[PDB]
Design a protein around this motif. Structure first.
Motif, PDB file in Angstrom:
ATOM      1  N   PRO A  14      63.312 -23.641  86.368  1.00  0.00           N
ATOM      2  CA  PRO A  14      62.319 -22.850  87.108  1.00  0.00           C
ATOM      3  C   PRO A  14      62.989 -21.854  88.044  1.00  0.00           C
TER       4      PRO A  14
ATOM      5  N   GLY B 204      62.073 -18.620  91.012  1.00  0.00           N
ATOM      6  CA  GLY B 204      61.202 -17.824  91.854  1.00  0.00           C
ATOM      7  C   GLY B 204      61.775 -16.431  92.058  1.00  0.00           C
TER       8      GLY B 204
ATOM      9  N   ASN C 270      64.840 -15.960  93.088  1.00  0.00           N
ATOM     10  CA  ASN C 270      66.279 -16.037  92.790  1.00  0.00           C
ATOM     11  C   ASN C 270      67.138 -15.570  93.970  1.00  0.00           C
ATOM     12  N   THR C 271      66.725 -15.930  95.184  1.00  0.00           N
ATOM     13  CA  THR C 271      67.500 -15.706  96.399  1.00  0.00           C
ATOM     14  C   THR C 271      68.164 -16.976  96.933  1.00  0.00           C
ATOM     15  N   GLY C 272      67.980 -18.107  96.246  1.00  0.00           N
ATOM     16  CA  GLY C 272      68.605 -19.359  96.653  1.00  0.00           C
ATOM     17  C   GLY C 272      70.118 -19.271  96.705  1.00  0.00           C
TER      18      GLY C 272
ATOM     19  N   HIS D  32      59.857 -16.114  96.667  1.00  0.00           N
ATOM     20  CA  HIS D  32      58.508 -16.510  96.295  1.00  0.00           C
ATOM     21  C   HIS D  32      58.089 -17.710  97.129  1.00  0.00           C
TER      22      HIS D  32
ATOM     23  N   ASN E 203      60.086 -21.087  98.309  1.00  0.00           N
ATOM     24  CA  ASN E 203      60.191 -21.556  99.688  1.00  0.00           C
ATOM     25  C   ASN E 203      59.777 -23.020  99.810  1.00  0.00           C
TER      26      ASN E 203
ATOM     27  N   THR F 294      62.376 -25.362  98.026  1.00  0.00           N
ATOM     28  CA  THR F 294      63.614 -25.543  98.780  1.00  0.00           C
ATOM     29  C   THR F 294      63.391 -26.059 100.194  1.00  0.00           C
TER      30      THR F 294
ATOM     31  N   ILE G 115      55.924 -26.119  90.982  1.00  0.00           N
ATOM     32  CA  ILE G 115      54.860 -25.747  91.903  1.00  0.00           C
ATOM     33  C   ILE G 115      54.216 -24.477  91.372  1.00  0.00           C
TER      34      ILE G 115
ATOM     35  N   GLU H  88      69.504 -26.144 105.438  1.00  0.00           N
ATOM     36  CA  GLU H  88      68.402 -25.288 105.011  1.00  0.00           C
ATOM     37  C   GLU H  88      68.389 -25.011 103.519  1.00  0.00           C
TER      38      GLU H  88
ATOM     39  N   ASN I 268      65.403 -28.640  85.482  1.00  0.00           N
ATOM     40  CA  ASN I 268      66.572 -28.315  86.296  1.00  0.00           C
ATOM     41  C   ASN I 268      67.692 -29.362  86.181  1.00  0.00           C
TER      42      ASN I 268
HETATM   43  C1  FAD Z   1      69.280 -12.722 102.779  1.00  0.00           C
HETATM   44  C2  FAD Z   1      68.845 -14.154 102.598  1.00  0.00           C
HETATM   45  C3  FAD Z   1      68.402 -14.877 103.698  1.00  0.00           C
HETATM   46  C4  FAD Z   1      67.991 -16.201 103.569  1.00  0.00           C
HETATM   47  N1  FAD Z   1      67.565 -16.867 104.709  1.00  0.00           N
HETATM   48  C5  FAD Z   1      67.182 -18.102 104.588  1.00  0.00           C
HETATM   49  C6  FAD Z   1      66.733 -18.787 105.781  1.00  0.00           C
HETATM   50  O1  FAD Z   1      66.674 -18.299 106.910  1.00  0.00           O
HETATM   51  N2  FAD Z   1      66.349 -20.086 105.569  1.00  0.00           N
HETATM   52  C7  FAD Z   1      66.355 -20.754 104.357  1.00  0.00           C
HETATM   53  O2  FAD Z   1      65.982 -21.932 104.324  1.00  0.00           O
HETATM   54  N3  FAD Z   1      66.794 -20.113 103.237  1.00  0.00           N
HETATM   55  C8  FAD Z   1      67.177 -18.845 103.350  1.00  0.00           C
HETATM   56  N4  FAD Z   1      67.600 -18.170 102.210  1.00  0.00           N
HETATM   57  C9  FAD Z   1      67.608 -18.888 100.902  1.00  0.00           C
HETATM   58  C10 FAD Z   1      66.271 -19.565 100.554  1.00  0.00           C
HETATM   59  O3  FAD Z   1      66.405 -20.870  99.985  1.00  0.00           O
HETATM   60  C11 FAD Z   1      65.484 -18.697  99.585  1.00  0.00           C
HETATM   61  O4  FAD Z   1      65.753 -17.359  99.987  1.00  0.00           O
HETATM   62  C12 FAD Z   1      64.000 -19.071  99.705  1.00  0.00           C
HETATM   63  O5  FAD Z   1      63.868 -20.454 100.036  1.00  0.00           O
HETATM   64  C13 FAD Z   1      63.093 -18.789  98.522  1.00  0.00           C
HETATM   65  O6  FAD Z   1      63.830 -18.906  97.292  1.00  0.00           O
HETATM   66  P1  FAD Z   1      63.343 -18.171  95.983  1.00  0.00           P
HETATM   67  O7  FAD Z   1      61.843 -17.891  95.853  1.00  0.00           O
HETATM   68  O8  FAD Z   1      64.216 -16.985  95.793  1.00  0.00           O
HETATM   69  O9  FAD Z   1      63.678 -19.292  94.906  1.00  0.00           O
HETATM   70  P2  FAD Z   1      64.775 -19.386  93.768  1.00  0.00           P
HETATM   71  O10 FAD Z   1      66.132 -19.011  94.358  1.00  0.00           O
HETATM   72  O11 FAD Z   1      64.316 -18.668  92.561  1.00  0.00           O
HETATM   73  O12 FAD Z   1      64.760 -20.944  93.461  1.00  0.00           O
HETATM   74  C14 FAD Z   1      65.288 -21.900  94.405  1.00  0.00           C
HETATM   75  C15 FAD Z   1      65.161 -23.309  93.875  1.00  0.00           C
HETATM   76  O13 FAD Z   1      63.771 -23.708  93.827  1.00  0.00           O
HETATM   77  C16 FAD Z   1      63.367 -23.920  92.482  1.00  0.00           C
HETATM   78  N5  FAD Z   1      62.051 -23.309  92.314  1.00  0.00           N
HETATM   79  C17 FAD Z   1      61.711 -21.991  92.484  1.00  0.00           C
HETATM   80  N6  FAD Z   1      60.437 -21.737  92.299  1.00  0.00           N
HETATM   81  C18 FAD Z   1      59.896 -22.980  92.000  1.00  0.00           C
HETATM   82  C19 FAD Z   1      58.583 -23.403  91.707  1.00  0.00           C
HETATM   83  N7  FAD Z   1      57.526 -22.583  91.653  1.00  0.00           N
HETATM   84  N8  FAD Z   1      58.390 -24.717  91.456  1.00  0.00           N
HETATM   85  C20 FAD Z   1      59.437 -25.544  91.505  1.00  0.00           C
HETATM   86  N9  FAD Z   1      60.715 -25.261  91.772  1.00  0.00           N
HETATM   87  C21 FAD Z   1      60.879 -23.957  92.011  1.00  0.00           C
HETATM   88  C22 FAD Z   1      64.474 -23.356  91.584  1.00  0.00           C
HETATM   89  O14 FAD Z   1      64.587 -24.102  90.376  1.00  0.00           O
HETATM   90  C23 FAD Z   1      65.712 -23.536  92.472  1.00  0.00           C
HETATM   91  O15 FAD Z   1      66.281 -24.838  92.404  1.00  0.00           O
HETATM   92  C24 FAD Z   1      68.031 -16.820 102.304  1.00  0.00           C
HETATM   93  C25 FAD Z   1      68.482 -16.099 101.203  1.00  0.00           C
HETATM   94  C26 FAD Z   1      68.888 -14.772 101.335  1.00  0.00           C
HETATM   95  C27 FAD Z   1      69.364 -14.017 100.123  1.00  0.00           C
END
Ligand code: FAD
Ligand code: FAD
Lengths: 467, 466
Positions: B75, B77, B79-81, B146, B150, B153, B212, B422, B459
């Protein structure tokens, strides 16, 4: 009629095993077991023949290890203030009490992190942290008797929930003993920690059906410099709702409680507890608390709020206090409602989440539907959180009144997409009405969680999940 | 490390997926390059299929098929993880929430938001702020992350100090389990104690227990007044005393307390060309307040600054309430992670430590690596005891890695700290959880994984130990 499941029974050999595991913590006298077998409402009585009172987590582990090998059912108990029959045995389950697990382990005077045993009494923890300029993130009318472990197990809401939120947020860690005696160490006294699954969350609101909480780590907010309470009479429920809306708009972040009660509540607290009302007689009353860092600013916010509320007719009469004595007196009018009800007669109790706009409707309806069969009908509670406490009192229990109340009250709530148990939890009483608030697939996953964590079902049988 | 015995996508699987999500089957090799590479650009999968469902039912039918066929699913979202959780290790199917981007309802009085998992955080903030509410979380990744990611994670972020955890602010979730089962926990009630709080298992579960698809979340009211003070402090003792005084003098209006050291400021100026608004200092503190009476807030801030400047806790400070300048000051903190990735190779640690010793590891590492690192920096959420620790080098060195690990994890464990405050676990941290979690806890985690996803199709290779 519920049927006893095929658990074993406590022998003399089991009693000697418990005396070894907790020396001096085994109570077998039948007259001594009367009280812990009866629920807070005094309408349920168990047939337990042994009360165990361990002091330590290791003792709880060994007790459960023994009970698991012997197939003996166990009824965890804290303060025994629960309202839904979860706290006392149905048949002869062993009562495992946390009364003597009442030590504070540590308190960090900067982070405000408290770590303490499950049997510490809420009011005593409040006194302990307040001496150090912190407060407990929760408070409730049962504070004098309820245990922190009980609060976590029931996921207790309470009187400052609007400000500090759920135990799902404020609990930092738990130590839990599983049914086979495995000590699960999730006692992470850290504000943030994303190192795997949040296992502790499973035990918040699980009501002792998945494990016994032995140690709690909890985040304590700082003690506010200024606390104000206003107690207000409103001429109708519509004005109560606008007083709430206006209150959020003008007090904002300093709001720490919003409670309502009706005229009948005020009469019963006056009649049974002799507490005089400090405002003119009104059909509804509202208690507002604020908590903040600057006394002057909070007074200005409150002054303007009252002016506008009184100006636009939302409030007909009101009084304000900052003196600790007067503040506690005003709070007593709301906190002691539950006691006044149980002095009035047999109590039919419903604890509902509903749309705030329709929160009091059921009370008006039931006053008409039951008529003189009800001695009194009341509505009160956590209006800011959408939570109604509905109560009906009568001289004695009657099947005729119960048939008028049920399923009618539960159908009303499902019709509103509400919760048939907002805060008190499920326990024995509500185990078979969860379908009004939860779909079948969710209920099945809960059953699988129970089977995984307690496959023998020795922990709190007959409750929390459906039969 | 080694690919588990999952099936391989056949021509018949592609045709099944085309029936389930018509228009949402991406197999173009050049289109799959970006979704196979993580945000840090140090991990790259080899997935040959990207699926972009529109609805929850489409997700359910995909997983039913993947379950029957024993195909692994990754999965994704925004892709900022940061921990390699969001990209495949091998040829896992990438299931993207990119098209699951509708708001479903918003109650203008309660502030309750129901939306699909692929709504971008920034866009949700815009939506609810137009209606005088705010999201209970915010992050530097807001433009891309997304809401589903959030929640998966258990994201913390920049307003956690005020509004707290998603474990508290999330009211309901719709989750699709590995076999396609739709789990409905999408209640919208503030209080509901009718059984186990099942949704909590999926907050922080990183896509290993279910996908989710819908989130219900409590949005706080939008503040009438937001103030930001960006302050220069002459040492970490003063940073800590500024924090203590801040809680005593600002109190309930406090909504953020962030810090950064001198090298952080230098790196954002060098790589991002963002100028500092105050005199050079060894440490900087960003304080935010949020309140209902702008005048009361301004008076509180006034007395705080006067006391902090007067007692030598702060050397120089700038304040802002204008939306444009507030975002400028915030940008100095929010864009550090970007400035670091432009400095060379980044060794990244996200630690929970006692606040009183939050910076000690930074001072320790500077002596320990001296000239073998380009820079060592410390910044982050001091109010929540959360240090972002980074070491940069012109190129990766196995030597520098051997100096940092396990040492950094052992130091943290010596403080009973968290080795991932985090960002979570994902691929990167799956074998270092023993520094924060005992074996019995990690074992029960594995039992829950086995109950919810016995085939392990969701995953693989992440979140739990090998
Ligand atoms: C500039 C920057 C700043 C950041 N600051 C913070 C911060 O202050 N605090 C913090 O906690 N994090 C921070 N992060 C990282 C943070 O974890 C992600 O940015 C955020 O939580 C949302 O991730 P995403 O939607 O990009 O998920 P993704 O990176 O796409 O996925 C993250 C994980 O969740 C899973 N996942 C995604 N979507 C779903 C879904 N719908 N259902 C089930 N599993 C799913 C994926 O398989 C993966 O394991 C930051 C990242 C960057 C690049
Ligand atoms: C006057 C009054 C006011 C109240 N006000 C509120 C209120 O505002 N909000 C609210 O939510 N509730 C309220 N309650 C009820 C509330 O649930 C209890 O006050 C309290 O949360 C339970 O604590 P206890 O130690 O008495 O638990 P008990 O009644 O002893 O037990 C509660 C349940 O949890 C289990 N349990 C107890 N201890 C443990 C443990 N250590 N580990 C595992 N399982 C355990 C028991 O088996 C039982 O199922 C009130 C009750 C009274 C009498």
């Amino acid at each position: 009629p519920v049927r006893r499941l095929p658990f074993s029974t406590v022998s003399k050999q089991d009693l000697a095993a418990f005396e070894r595991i907790v020396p001096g913590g085994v109570v077998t006298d039948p007259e001594a077991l009367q009280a812990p077998n009866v629920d807070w409402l005094r309408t349920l009585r168990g047939c337990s023949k042994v009360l165990l009172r361990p002091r330590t987590s290791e003792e709880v582990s060994h007790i459960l290890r023994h009970c698991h090998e012997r197939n003996l059912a166990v009824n965890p108990q804290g303060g025994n203030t629960g309202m839904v029959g979860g706290s006392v045995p149905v048949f002869d389950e062993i009562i495992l009490s946390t009364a003597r697990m009442n030590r504070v382990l540590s308190f960090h005077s900067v982070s405000g992190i408290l770590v303490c045993q499950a049997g510490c009494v809420l009011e005593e923890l409040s006194r302990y942290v307040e001496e150090r300029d912190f407060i407990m993130p929760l408070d409730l009318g049962a504070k004098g008797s309820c245990h922190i472990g009980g609060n976590v197990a029931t996921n207790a809401g309470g009187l400052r929930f609007l400000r500090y939120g759920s135990l799902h947020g404020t609990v930092l860690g738990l130590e839990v003993v599983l049914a086979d005696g495995t000590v699960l160490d999730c006692l992470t006294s850290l504000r943030k920690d994303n190192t795997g699954y949040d296992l502790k969350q499973l035990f918040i609101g699980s009501e002792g059906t998945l494990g016994i909480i032995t140690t709690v780590s909890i985040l304590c907010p700082p003690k506010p410099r200024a606390v104000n309470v206003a107690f207000l009479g409103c001429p109708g429920f519509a004005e109560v709702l606008q007083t709430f809306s206006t209150c959020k708009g003008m007090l904002g972040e300093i709001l720490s409680a919003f409670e309502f009660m009706d005229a009948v509540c005020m009469q019963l607290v006056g009649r049974h507890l002799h507490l005089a009302s400090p405002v003119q007689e009104s059909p509804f009353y509202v208690l507002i608390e604020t908590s903040g860092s600057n006394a002057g600013h909070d007074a200005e916010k409150l002054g303007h709020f009252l002016e506008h509320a009184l100006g636009s007719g939302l409030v007909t009469d009101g009084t304000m206090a900052t003196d600790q004595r007067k503040v506690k007196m005003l709070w007593a009018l709301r906190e002691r409602i539950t006691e006044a009800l149980s002095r009035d007669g047999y109590v039919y109790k419903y604890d509902l989440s509903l749309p705030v706009e329709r929160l009091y409707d059921i009370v008006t309806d039931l006053r008409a539907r039951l008529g003189p069969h009800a001695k009194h009908v009341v509505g009160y509670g956590h209006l800011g959180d959408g939570n109604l406490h509905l109560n009906v009192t009568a001289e004695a229990f009657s099947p005729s009144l119960l048939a008028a109340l049920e399923p009618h009250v539960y159908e009303w709530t499902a019709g509103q997409q509400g919760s048939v148990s907002a805060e008190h939890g499920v326990g024995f009483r509500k185990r078979d009405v969860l379908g009004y608030s939860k779909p079948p697939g969710a209920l099945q996953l809960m059953q699988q969680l129970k089977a995984l964590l307690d496959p023998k079902g020795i922990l709190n049988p007959y409750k929390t999940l459906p039969s």
